[PDB]
């Protein structure tokens, strides 16, 4: 009955959308925090805000967004749209709603109102990243020119946007590091992962997954953005050295969304079929399976 | 034109550390 799963902003937690509601977990160690069997229509998307009491929920038909106060156990805000809502991103002062062709920014008050609209290319995957840091309101998304990422500063919206020619074809994945300073992107060819500085838009690192094609599902940095982990559509997760001088291949591999765990040599993986894996690795790339659990039960 | 609907009077107040670590 699982419809969606995503990590929160520091990957300390993940949240799942169910046909019968939603669930919130602590990532490492795997501990279920809350469950809400109450929504009959289910939720297709769930966004957290670190470990705060609010979640953003995408309704049954994905037409309405619901702001859920879990300390009050109630929807306190509802925003209805005339298009499918593909994704929602939160920071302390902003609610960002991703439609398949545009992104719409609202205040985060008891009665939100619209602030900005941003045209995107066709964005059925709802790709978007939003830094939540107090000193960095970076918002990034697929530009109208296919394969380019547009970077906007929500604290300084009068500027012109930075435009990164990340790929020549359709983007498939975009991730942001914890410091808001690096973005990693991949296209549907999935052959190169490319990491860019967010204030200048210039290439920092390019990694090779393989000459062959495999569809990226998720990318994530570790705490200091010295490693990244990547999951592929044939039950495959690679990790990479992110600040190595030259262009490099995968440090390590193992056999879905993925993030680094509590310990700096730990990696977590959560699968659409209900599986949860924790793996441990070595400076040289040995990958040990540590935990397997069916986290839905 | 999206339709915003408010369903609770008081302000929004971010309570960090709600989903505490085990």
Author numbering:
A (entry chain A): 9 to 263, 270 to 311
B (entry chain B): 1378 to 1399
Reported in the publication:
PROPPINs adopt a seven-bladed β-propeller fold, in which the two neighboring sites in blades 5–6 contribute to the binding of phosphoinositides. In this study, we determine the structure of WIPI3 in complex with the WIR-peptide from ATG2A.
Fortunately, a loop-deletion mutant of WIPI3 (referred to as WIPI3-Δloop), with deletions of two flexible loops (Blade 2 B–C loop (75–80) and Blade 6 C–D loop (264–281)), shows enhanced protein sample quality and has been crystallized for structural determination. After extensive trials, the crystals of WIPI3-Δloop with N-terminal fusion of the WIR-peptide were obtained for structural determination. The complex structure was determined by the molecular replacement method and refined to 2.2 Å. The β-propeller resembles a disk-like structure with a narrower top and a wider bottom from the side view and the WIR-peptide forms a linear structure and tightly entwines around the β-propeller from the rim to bottom.
